[PDB]
Design a protein around this ligand. Structure first.
Ligand SMILES: *[C@@H]1O[C@H](CO)[C@@H](O[C@@H]2O[C@H](CO)[C@@H](O[C@@H]3O[C@H](CO[C@H]4O[C@H](CO[C@H]5O[C@H](CO)[C@@H](O)[C@H](O)[C@@H]5O)[C@@H](O)[C@H](O[C@H]5O[C@H](CO)[C@@H](O)[C@H](O)[C@@H]5O)[C@@H]4O)[C@@H](O)[C@H](O[C@H]4O[C@H](CO)[C@@H](O)[C@H](O)[C@@H]4O[C@H]4O[C@H](CO)[C@@H](O)[C@H](O)[C@@H]4O[C@H]4O[C@H](CO)[C@@H](O)[C@H](O)[C@@H]4O)[C@@H]3O)[C@H](O)[C@H]2NC(C)=O)[C@H](O)[C@H]1NC(C)=O
Ligand SMILES: *[C@@H]1O[C@H](CO)[C@@H](O[C@@H]2O[C@H](CO)[C@@H](O[C@@H]3O[C@H](CO[C@H]4O[C@H](CO[C@H]5O[C@H](CO)[C@@H](O)[C@H](O)[C@@H]5O)[C@@H](O)[C@H](O[C@H]5O[C@H](CO)[C@@H](O)[C@H](O)[C@@H]5O)[C@@H]4O)[C@@H](O)[C@H](O[C@H]4O[C@H](CO)[C@@H](O)[C@H](O)[C@@H]4O[C@H]4O[C@H](CO)[C@@H](O)[C@H](O)[C@@H]4O[C@H]4O[C@H](CO)[C@@H](O)[C@H](O)[C@@H]4O)[C@@H]3O)[C@H](O)[C@H]2NC(C)=O)[C@H](O)[C@H]1NC(C)=O
Ligand SMILES: *[C@@H]1O[C@H](CO)[C@@H](O[C@@H]2O[C@H](CO)[C@@H](O[C@@H]3O[C@H](CO[C@H]4O[C@H](CO[C@H]5O[C@H](CO)[C@@H](O)[C@H](O)[C@@H]5O)[C@@H](O)[C@H](O[C@H]5O[C@H](CO)[C@@H](O)[C@H](O)[C@@H]5O)[C@@H]4O)[C@@H](O)[C@H](O[C@H]4O[C@H](CO)[C@@H](O)[C@H](O)[C@@H]4O[C@H]4O[C@H](CO)[C@@H](O)[C@H](O)[C@@H]4O[C@H]4O[C@H](CO)[C@@H](O)[C@H](O)[C@@H]4O)[C@@H]3O)[C@H](O)[C@H]2NC(C)=O)[C@H](O)[C@H]1NC(C)=O
Ligand SMILES: *[C@@H]1O[C@H](CO)[C@@H](O[C@@H]2O[C@H](CO)[C@@H](O[C@@H]3O[C@H](CO[C@H]4O[C@H](CO[C@H]5O[C@H](CO)[C@@H](O)[C@H](O)[C@@H]5O)[C@@H](O)[C@H](O[C@H]5O[C@H](CO)[C@@H](O)[C@H](O)[C@@H]5O)[C@@H]4O)[C@@H](O)[C@H](O[C@H]4O[C@H](CO)[C@@H](O)[C@H](O)[C@@H]4O[C@H]4O[C@H](CO)[C@@H](O)[C@H](O)[C@@H]4O[C@H]4O[C@H](CO)[C@@H](O)[C@H](O)[C@@H]4O)[C@@H]3O)[C@H](O)[C@H]2NC(C)=O)[C@H](O)[C@H]1NC(C)=O
Ligand SMILES: *[C@@H]1O[C@H](CO)[C@@H](O)[C@H](O)[C@H]1NC(C)=O
Ligand SMILES: *[C@@H]1O[C@H](CO)[C@@H](O)[C@H](O)[C@H]1NC(C)=O
Ligand SMILES: *[C@@H]1O[C@H](CO)[C@@H](O)[C@H](O)[C@H]1NC(C)=O
Ligand SMILES: *[C@@H]1O[C@H](CO)[C@@H](O)[C@H](O)[C@H]1NC(C)=O
Ligand SMILES: *[C@@H]1O[C@H](CO)[C@@H](O)[C@H](O)[C@H]1NC(C)=O
Ligand SMILES: [Ca+2]
Ligand SMILES: [Ca+2]
Ligand SMILES: [Ca+2]
Ligand SMILES: [Ca+2]
Lengths: 388, 388, 388, 388
């Protein structure tokens, strides 16, 4: 096996097609399905799998009570076959913790899990299913990472971490790993003012991460990483098509180098594909809550502070709950370009549906097509009343 | 690995032997068995598997309520080990959608799933477990396909699609795929007047598909495909032994080039093996409903409008519910001929058994023997009262 | 891979050690464990597995009601990992039917299942997981076979079948298969007067089968098969240590060439290892019912009509239910001799425990040791009251 | 494949990081999780797995009643994927019995299980999943072994056994196996006065086992084994940091060659890493019961009868139940040193929590880091009230 190199550009995105969906909450009403949240998708050279943070209980289990909570000793990064649900019997534990990322470099997979109390957390870096390196908290305030896949080039896999306040300036670092070992780390540079939960993808131009500004911004910060030089820059998506949640209404001028104001101390993990005229942004339909999901084609969104949509696709109706979203691609697929893909977490239960005492989710995932395909909408599909 | 070529003729069919049976509804009374419908069987070079469209819920699950419905966002093509039932924990998702086909070309498997609303559906073509090509609806009226396996020759895998009315003229296309890519498509030609749900098999003479005329016909249309020239012809089975359901009683003269009349706007997926004196037709025993199943040896049924049975075998008693049926063969078996096989879907629940709120099925499957074997009958075997 | 040859003799048997036990009924009280009966064990070159006839329902499932019945359309030969229980999710279906045998020849496995009504049954012979040959009933009265593993030598795998009365003379045939194909069959010859449910093992001397005389005998008939010449002889175990069940008390003179009288129209599947001074016989402890199990060292039991035990080992206490027992060996183990092994079916439920409506079993299995090991006893271990 | 040689020293231990945790009791509240106890962890060259003695029932199963009992015919050594729980459907049975050890030699795995009544127990030694050798009881009083992994060097795998009193002098033997065969055994020599449940690890210096003195000692006996010469020595950990449970308070002078007195006829399985200045000891926090767990860095604990801690890490709070603990390492990991690892059994149910009728456990496991990582605490996490 050889390390994968990012030698291709993105395929032209003319629409999005259904890729995967697990219907986990529907099935978990009467099966041993683990409670999860913060899901993602990641490919190996021979298989693509669903990933998420388990809560160490099934949905119908009495221990599902209280699973709105983010950080417990009972969480772990698990993976399971594409579009199956995460069950007790089919889920493979990658590592133990409550914040994660994972990626295959072409030879083996690196997985990183952070665990610990708020003031004493630590990351453990696994490579080829063995622990290899560890990183202690540097700011003693909830060391945390991407919650979606990382990306590798010639064995080098950059990962974005943040330690510090969620409501003020924090200490963000970009780490560069190879075979699980730390080659280098850097402090965040550039004009992004707060960074959390980066969603990344790679192509010949380098690695592009679309993150969340939890502090002041409703536009999304972007980190652009050169995995060869092991350097990065940062800014915001310039476009006035704002993609955090909650968020203000779309203005006609966005902000390239500072947070667009209106909403403080909140946000949701999201993603974009920034590729000139082939640029597509994901966002919740609602400006107020994590409901609905749509893709918008916004030419030069990264660099054009006046850019508006010229095409779109609804993924989840506003009437249906969404949640986190992130990027991944099958870097080992045949062809001359990388096909952009994404997932949307469909959160069920608390806080929005409080007649149940649990919080979980299911997954829907799409990839791009060069055709202009008809659109459907893709709800979680579970009836909450059944769980009462 | 090499692409499989269709170099053999059919084995002589003197009777049918039991091949597989999953007892899914019996077992699902007290296990995590997925609700399915539209099952089939398909072989890889090293394994044969059961396939079906899941409904994204188990039978005992409360979400089984309403599963008579054909098209939802919660359906997917799944496969699972031969004669096991389709469980949450053993089922592998091939793709997402509510109409499907799948076949192995000798190197890798192609699977096709259609999803979407009635007026905006699309097919996604997967090859070696990755999405490769997509096809948008061309008539904006429930794009739909075989619901049983396709067949390949030297890498070329033809598939029959229909888009348009189920109760009038529609737009049927034959697509020719290789490694998931579209080589060519054609509009339906010949004398078949309506085409749905083709059941296909291959042998040295080419690929033969027995389909359903939903509009006016109770004889079955046939499409004969040359996978090298990538051309086809169509007509009906000439025989007065009528094999759709519901259907009129058998006359003494059938129809080769037009629907045999009496029943409109209905039908069931079915199959036949058309091989001169070695010809066998499958049909429900009842002329009114999807109950019973029998095989009849009808020499030259394809071309002889007077042909009658000279031998038969009961598969399912008229007292027991049947459903869809279709063809498959193990193209990678040893020997000098291809052994004809088929499955029968045994539908339980709605609409015929409405004391439960679900619709599902189990599977029975047979292959041919050159012996003249004794016959049994093969019911689903579940007691509906247990589910109340 | 090469065909296995029977080149070794039996290891010296000085005691028996625990090999496997699945505790299926205990576990099935609260898990999705299939109802079974007629279990056995059989090895591949790289794995040994448990086998049995499923009843197509779990124990806790409502369809467990009525499973005392031997022959239904819902039965199948399944296999599952050594000492695991037969669950819905881990059981692999080998073929469909209600009487079976199975064996590996060193290259691939042959499995045979018989299905059908009493007067029209048929055997289907599978090889390398594909159907290869079929055999129709020859006496139209419950065609039936070993219910434990067959044995192979240089690709030739003999199997004993019986068709006809269980309470009078029947038509027994020995079939010789290679790669699933019929090389030859013979009618039973020799002095055995009735043959059912042969338990076989192989060693340099040939293949030895210990069977059951259901008609008149309480001594066990023996068939000795030369798999090279494809010929056989038959007689009874000469020893007055009688090993059928039910049975008369042990006399001081046994019978070599005729059934020992006292009990008609009954019996149980059993086994022995016949190896001169290294001879051990298995039997139920009770003379009246299928309870208890013991091994007795009876020198030259096959040929000495005065032979008595000189050593023994209790396997199951008389207070605990037993059932069928049979032989198998790991022909692919290291060393200079074949280690004799056996299983005992531990039947729970009907007819002996009729407060439940089901019949199932668990498995215990032992292999020989050259040490003189201490003995334990090995009950099924389930409490019937828990199922009420 | 080659036999593994112990060519590396221990990595420098500066803290401990989370390695695995299965949350078995939480999950088993509503899943088919087997009741276990006496767990451990052991690596193959390509995978690390959890191990334990099943009780042959699930937790929610009615047969969980009475599982405080140590020795029944329904127990078996099972293994299952790292950090998954031990379920009916994912657990692989290694052998049958109520006391065990297991280790991989680089080519294949040896597993040993002891079964039988108290006065007639026997060990069966399995290698490459086949029974190879058997050992009868030599003192007729509960033949018993490590309950955690053994260690191998160049194919030789030493194992410590004890047969005889738990409350007085007993007969301890060290056996040396290769490919499952007995090369040699020795009677215990040295100054250890009672030996049970040894926890072992290997490094260039040889194999080191930290055991339990059940009779008189609250310091731990140590056996040091040379796997090449196949010889051993024994003594106690000299340190006054006492590590059995229950135990007296820590004095200022320990005992090197005799049991430290205060507590008789009790103890718990435990472990240590004895490596000069890199020495770390594990112990329960409580001196009275199996609650809490901590690691203490105690330089030269093995040889210095005045040695005290200079660093520590809490693993489980005193408020939470612990249990057995033992050592293992991934001998096939990359790098220049072996990373010390351990597990802690977290016992739930009887005798400490008697509102339920069962006894089971979950597992937490840690490995060493060269970083000084922040510490968390790792409870079982189940709420007993949910099981009522
Ligand atoms: C079968 O399936 C197919 C395929 O899916 C379906 O076809 C799809 O239909 C959907 C729905 O209509 C389309 O999505 C929308 O796309 C438009 C963009 O395309 C329109 O505008 C383009 C740009 O026009 C402008 O610039 C050009 C440049 O020259 C100029 O020419 C023009 O005059 C104008 O200046 C046009 O080019 C384009 O025309 C082309 O396409 C037409 C078909 O769509 C075709 O008919 C034409 O001939 C031509 O070929 C077209 O006019 C997006 O704007 C739109 O997204 C907005 O609206 C949705 C609600 O529907 C909303 O959720 C979005 O967020 C967004 O609106 C918000 O943001 C805006 C930007 O800030 C803001 O301005 C809005 O006010 C609004 O803001 C408010 O809401 C948000 C969200 O809550 C909030 O955050 C804000 O604060 C605020 O409150 C849709 O994405 C697909 O593109 C189309 N696909 C294809 C291939 O055709 C088909 O319908 C299905 N068939 C059936 C029968 O069902
Ligand atoms: C153990 O197992 C074995 C193996 O399974 C069992 O043996 C099997 O038994 C079954 C049941 O009997 C047989 O199936 C039937 O086969 C007949 C065809 O064979 C008969 O007819 C042949 C043709 O004869 C004609 O042509 C020849 C040509 O020369 C001429 O010689 C002759 O005079 C006549 O003109 C004969 O050749 C054949 O004889 C041979 O075989 C005999 C054994 O079967 C043997 O005894 C002879 O010596 C000789 O060797 C034999 O006479 C099928 O016709 C039949 O199918 C019809 O009937 C069933 C109901 O039973 C029905 O469901 C079918 O759909 C069909 O009837 C409908 O369709 C017809 C065609 O349109 C129509 O004409 C009918 O009126 C009827 O239509 C009505 O119902 C349908 C359905 O609902 C509806 O759609 C219509 O609208 C309308 O309402 C059976 O398939 C097996 O062939 C046979 N197998 C073997 C190898 O023997 C054995 O019984 C078991 N043993 C025990 C003890 O249980
Ligand atoms: C720890 O574990 C170890 C290892 O498991 C335990 O040791 C084992 O203990 C068991 C139980 O005792 C033994 O099993 C029995 O073995 C005897 C055979 O051995 C005895 O007889 C031998 C033959 O003696 C005769 O011939 C010799 C030839 O020269 C001659 O010398 C002698 O005088 C006599 O003529 C002796 O050689 C042998 O002695 C040797 O071994 C002794 C230890 O056993 C040792 O002390 C001596 O020094 C010497 O080394 C010994 O005396 C079997 O006969 C017996 O099986 C019968 O009895 C059981 C009930 O216990 C029954 O279930 C069997 O079916 C059978 O009895 C039935 O069948 C007979 C034959 O037809 C019939 O005659 C009986 O009347 C009876 O029939 C009735 O019941 C049946 C069944 O329901 C029914 O069908 C009939 O119709 C009728 O109603 C046992 O198998 C093991 O051999 C022994 N193993 C070892 C290695 O020692 C140890 O006990 C454990 N420790 C503790 C503390 O628990
Ligand atoms: C974020 O995470 C990090 C990393 O986990 C956290 O930092 C960790 O904090 C914990 C908790 O404090 C530490 O564990 C303790 O470590 C001490 C050992 O270190 C202390 O002592 C060292 C030795 O000092 C002596 O010798 C030196 C030699 O020269 C001499 O200089 C000195 O004067 C003295 O003579 C010191 O070197 C060391 O200082 C160093 O480290 C300091 C940080 O810890 C730092 O500030 C200094 O600058 C310097 O760098 C330090 O002072 C262990 O002693 C202790 O274990 C005892 O106490 C716990 C209870 O807390 C108990 O459970 C243990 O069993 C043990 O106490 C029992 O046993 C003793 C031995 O017999 C006995 O003497 C005690 O009385 C007691 O016995 C009683 O209880 C037991 C158990 O029930 C019973 O059996 C007996 O019978 C009896 O009833 C802890 O293990 C970590 O080392 C530390 N890690 C690091 C890397 O810093 C950090 O806190 C977290 N942050 C936040 C905000 O939460
Ligand atoms: C990626 O590039 C490196 C450096 O040139 C090369 O060694 C490696 O083989 C490449 N990977 C692949 C898949 O070709
Ligand atoms: C099928 O035919 C093609 C074209 O001649 C050939 O290349 C291929 O190897 C054949 N497949 C097999 C299995 O021989
Ligand atoms: C068994 O004997 C046959 C015939 O001589 C030989 O060809 C075959 O290789 C042998 N099998 C093994 C495992 O050696
Ligand atoms: C361990 O040492 C032995 C004896 O020298 C050697 O034969 C074997 O290859 C070694 N194992 C490895 C993994 O190198
Ligand atoms: C467990 O068994 C005991 C008998 O030892 C019984 O008294 C008790 O009620 C049982 N517990 C349950 C929950 O049935
Ligand atoms: Ca924000
Ligand atoms: Ca019709
Ligand atoms: Ca008899
Ligand atoms: Ca002690």
């Amino acid at each position: 096996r050889n390390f994968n190199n990012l030698t291709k550009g993105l395929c032209t995105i003319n629409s999005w097609h259904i890729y995967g969906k697990d219907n986990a909450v529907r099935i978990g009403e009467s099966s041993d399905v683990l409670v999860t949240r913060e899901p993602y998708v990641s490919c190996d050279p021979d298989e693509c799998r669903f990933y998420a943070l388990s809560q160490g209980t099934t949905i119908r289990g009495k221990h599902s009570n209280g699973t709105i909570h983010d950080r417990s000793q009972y969480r772990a990064l698990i993976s399971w076959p594409l579009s199956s649900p995460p069950t007790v019997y089919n889920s493979r534990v990658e590592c133990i913790g409550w914040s994660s990322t994972s990626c295959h470099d072409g030879k083996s997979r690196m997985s990183i899990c952070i665990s610990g109390p708020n003031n004493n957390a630590s990351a453990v870096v696994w490579y080829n299913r063995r622990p290899v390196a560890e990183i202690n908290t540097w700011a003693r305030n909830i060391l945390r990472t991407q919650e979606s896949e990382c990306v590798c080039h010639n064995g080098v896999c950059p990962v974005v971490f943040t330690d510090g306040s969620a409501t003020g300036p924090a200490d963000t670092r970009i780490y560069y790993f190879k075979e699980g070992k730390i080659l280098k780390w850097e402090s965040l540079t550039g004009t992004a003012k707060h960074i959390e939960e980066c969603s990344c993808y790679g192509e010949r131009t380098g690695i592009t991460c679309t993150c969340k500004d939890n502090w002041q911004g409703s536009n999304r910060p972007v980190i652009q990483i050169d995995p060869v030089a092991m350097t990065h820059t940062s800014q915001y998506i310039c476009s006035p098509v704002l993609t955090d949640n909650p968020r203000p209404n779309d203005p006609n001028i966005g902000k390239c180098n500072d947070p667009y104001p209106g909403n403080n101390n909140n946000g949701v993990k999201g993603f974009s594909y920034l590729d000139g005229a082939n640029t597509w942004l994901g966002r919740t339909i609602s400006t107020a809550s994590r409901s609905g999901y749509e893709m918008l084609k916004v030419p030069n969104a990264l660099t054009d502070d006046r850019s508006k949509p010229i095409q779109g696709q609804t993924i989840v109706l506003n009437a249906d709950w969404s949640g986190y979203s992130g990027s991944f691609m099958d870097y080992w697929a045949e062809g001359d370009c990388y096909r952009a893909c994404f997932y949307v977490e469909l959160i069920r239960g608390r806080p929005k549906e409080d007649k149940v005492w649990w919080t979980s989710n299911s997954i829907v995932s799409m990839c791009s097509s060069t055709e202009f395909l008809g659109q459907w909408n893709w709800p979680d599909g579970a009836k909450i009343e059944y769980f009462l």
